[PDB]
Amino acid sequence: GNHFHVFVGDLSPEITTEDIKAAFAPFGRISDARVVKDMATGKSKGYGFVSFFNKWDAENAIQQMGGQWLGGRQIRTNWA
């Protein structure tokens, strides 16, 4: 049932859903992933979410991706 969700902040303007899933893919299997965009406009809000099936995969991803560079900018991670 309830999956395990990860908040990814400080994303580059043109980091896409595809990109963020490609970046978090090696940490375990991804149930879902998206970069949050404004509706009316369609611009990256500067953050996104990645969801895993395993609690361990999420907890690990938070620690290994925290402060890691994605695009030309350092991302931060936390529980969602």
Side-chain angles (χ1 to χ4, degrees), residues 1 3-17 19-80:
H3 281 167
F4 303 92
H5 311 272
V6 177
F7 166 88
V8 192
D10 294 346
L11 295 183
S12 269
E14 300 300 340
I15 282 298
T16 77
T17 286
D19 284 328
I20 202 182
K21 185 145 66 171
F24 273 80
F27 289 98
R29 312 233 320 139
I30 292 172
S31 68
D32 188 35
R34 80 190 194 93
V35 183
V36 180
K37 285 183 174 248
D38 171 274
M39 220 77 47
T41 66
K43 338 305 173 207
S44 182
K45 298 267 90 184
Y47 67 97
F49 297 99
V50 190
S51 299
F52 305 87
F53 304 87
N54 188 348
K55 174 130 182 140
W56 191 96
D57 291 349
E59 82 192 0
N60 190 47
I62 294 175
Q63 246 306 316
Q64 307 290 84
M65 285 312 269
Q68 231 61 48
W69 294 92
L70 195 51
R73 282 165 49 136
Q74 257 186 334
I75 74 179
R76 64 207 185 99
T77 59
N78 208 359
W79 285 105

